[PDB]
Structure formats: C-alpha cells, structure tokens
Amino acid sequence: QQVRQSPQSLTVWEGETAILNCSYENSAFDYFPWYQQFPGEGPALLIAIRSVSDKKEDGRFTIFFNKREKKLSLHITDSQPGDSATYFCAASRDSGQKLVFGQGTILKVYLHIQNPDPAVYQLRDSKSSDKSVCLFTDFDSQTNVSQSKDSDVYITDKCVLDMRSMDFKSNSAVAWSNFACANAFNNSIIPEDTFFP
C-alpha cells in the first residue's frame, strides 16, 4: 500500500521519548500531516511538515523528514499518559487536502506505580451472592496480564484508574467464570509478594 507505518503498536514508560516511523512511495507528495486519534473520537491534526522542509518542532512533538529515503519520523519527548492514542502518518499532493493514511501506530504510555501492592481479591454480586469475580489490583504497570489458556474463563486486559480526590493511581484486571481466584491468574506472571486473602 501507499503509506507504511511502524510499529503497529508501541509501548513506552512516561518521560521516555517515543519514536513513530512512516514511509511513503509516491514522490509527488508535497505535504505530510500527522493525525492523533483518542478512543471514541475522530482523528485530529497533531503536527505536519511539507516536502521543502527537513524537520519541524512543536512542543515535545517533532517531525523528521528524509526526502531522499522517502522516510518520515515523529518524535514525542517525555511521553505522558495523556499521549496514549493512535497516531497516523498521512500524505497529500494537495497541501493536506486529500489524505492517504498509514495503518496507524498505537501508542501506550505506562504509569510508574508509586507503591505497588499486588493483591487478588474476590467480589460477590450485589443481587445474587452465588456469583463472584476476581480482581487483580495495585500491581505495577510492568507486568503483563495474558489472556486465558481456555474458554469458560475470561480475563480482561489491564487498565489504570485515578482517584483524583486523593493523589493515587492503580492498575486492575478482572477475571470471571461459570472456579477459584487462586488459580485465576496462573497463566500470567504475578509478583511472589502478591497478597491472597
């Protein structure tokens, strides 16, 4: 296809410089915009360079352009959690009017957990106490919660929440079935100091 991007997904720790790559084939593109898309929204123009220039800086966001190698690059300095979005490299022959997009790069910026306290709690249903769920929480962002090694058992991906009344962020993942919570997250790695009440 016309505009290629890499990688398909990129994960970075907060404060780190994230680098997104893009390459095109047509030599008649006179303008290269980068569009940012947050979940649930439409894409919005982030930063853009035209073929006559070799670079452009705009507060943490920088485009490097190599007209010879047909290569483009987006540099995001001290990446922040709010920078987690999908990034599209785009090309235009009409100064930004008729865009061909890349496949897009998905960027995830990991939070540093102040005081990790990994524990697996279990929660009963408010309506029918015969149902329950397992909750992995207060773990550091470094760990990976891989999916189930079977059906009948489901495991959500991790997510971070922010109690703004305090000053506190925490990761969390949920499992359910029909089992026990002790063997719920076996397929993933858990810190040996994980609390099992």
Add this chain to the structure above:
Amino acid sequence: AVTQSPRNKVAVTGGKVTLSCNQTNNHNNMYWYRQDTGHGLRLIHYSYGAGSTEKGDIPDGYKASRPSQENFSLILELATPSQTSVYFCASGDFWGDTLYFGAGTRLSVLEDLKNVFPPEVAVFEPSEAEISHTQKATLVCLATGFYPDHVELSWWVNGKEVHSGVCTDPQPLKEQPALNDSRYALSSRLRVSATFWQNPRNHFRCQVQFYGLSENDEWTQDRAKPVTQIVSAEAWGR
C-alpha cells in the same frame, strides 16, 4: 463543526443505508472515510463542492451525494457485511493544511439480525479484604452477552456521573472467540475510599448504553426487542 448521523446503526444485508454529514465550517471539500484494523483510514468518496462528487480509493459498494455546501451523504444502497466499519466524515478548505473530522459512525451490517442482544449488567461489591488492607473500595461492573459491541459504559454515584477513580476496558472481549458470530463482554472498575463505601446513604450504579435496533425495524422473535436502551445495575453502601 462536523456532525454525522447516525452515530450508530444496525443493518440487515441488502438494506439501504444512508450516512449523512453536515458541516458548519463553510468548507468546500468534504470527505467520507472508513476505519478498519490494519487498514487505517481509507477514502471512499469526496467532493469539491455542491453538485459534484469524486470516487476515492475504495469507492466500490458506495455512492455519494453533495446536494448542499453543508451536506455530504454516503449511500449504501445494498448493504453487505463487508461494509461493517466506523465511518468518518471530514471537511477541508481549498488546499487546506488540515482536515476536520466528525466523531464517527459505528455501522454494523448484519445478515440474520437474530444475533442482536442487549447486555446483562451486574455490579460486584468491594471485598472486605481490600477494604481491610488498602483502605479503599473497588466496585466492578460486568456487562455480558451483547452484540454488536456498540456501547458506552459509565458510573453514577448519587445521581451524578463520575470519572475520577474509574477505568473501563479499552475494548469488549469475545465470549466465544472462535465464532465471529460471538457476542461480547465488558468490565469496569470504580474505586473509592473505604469510608465512602461504608456509607449506607451512598449508592453506586454501573450504566451501559446499548445501541441496537430502532423500533420501526421488524422483529419476528419471541424475546424482547433488542432496541437501543440503558441497562443498569446498582449497589448500596453497607
């Protein structure tokens, strides 16, 4: 501004589907893109002004119309499951450096329509151990057995919608990952202080906004109609 309509739509195969997009920006150029995984954004049709349209990179299956400067319509006269996607409209000026997109349109072109289901919602109460260890209370909402994945989940504490202390999954998971005919599941987490949960006056409800059939769609099934609806589950402090 750029508004699209509808924002969500369920269609049977062979049905006619029109997606309209109206623009305030007084721009001459208007566009209709679609977004799919591993393809990014792809141009379907565009327009340089009223009364004129042009074919994009993937025009096959679609027809467009620019009857007004403000309006640009994408027409699916014979809907096919291949046209299941998220459609974005956009407007731009002459040789403009930016394109102004709409919020998007979630379109599901089904065949049978008998696979459409609203979600069942359950809220699960904070564990005593968590409240006794970390001094905080995590409520977990769980929406299951719904199709298509056109939903919006939110938390409501004491009649007011909250965002702080909330995290939902980035995307629903498949209950039976084998079938693409499968229905989905979605979870969310609300986290508050142990004192707050201990308050019997406070009540918390997880609300999912399911987007399904319109009422003037033909329903031949026994079960209740899978229309667009709010499904809730609530828990009271103990």
